Amino acid sequence: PEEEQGSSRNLDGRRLRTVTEAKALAEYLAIKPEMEKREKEARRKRWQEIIEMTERKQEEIRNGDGKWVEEKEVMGERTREAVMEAMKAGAWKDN
């Protein structure tokens, strides 16, 4: 209702919108320095984290699959089985 009648006046001749804006500017002056600090170290921490991601990717490049590794294991066991059957059947033909 005060928002509806913001251009009306109090008993001391003051507009209700000016009472509201004075209260809002009081709140803004109370809150402004700490939120300035909050956004300051927010910027600091955020692009510090961006930096840290960049050197972690740099270290990943600096130091540089499943079907691959079980294919290697299965051919190793198959080659071993070939070795045992070869000297079980007597396949000595080396030179």
Binding site: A24, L25, E27, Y28, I31
Partner: peptide, 27 residues
Amino acid sequence: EIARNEWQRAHFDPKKQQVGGPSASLQ
């Protein structure tokens, strides 16, 4: 250009041409 403009006039389609945060303290 005159011939093309007459072609566009003849083939004009009216349906195709039809359709055409912050806080109170911060304020």
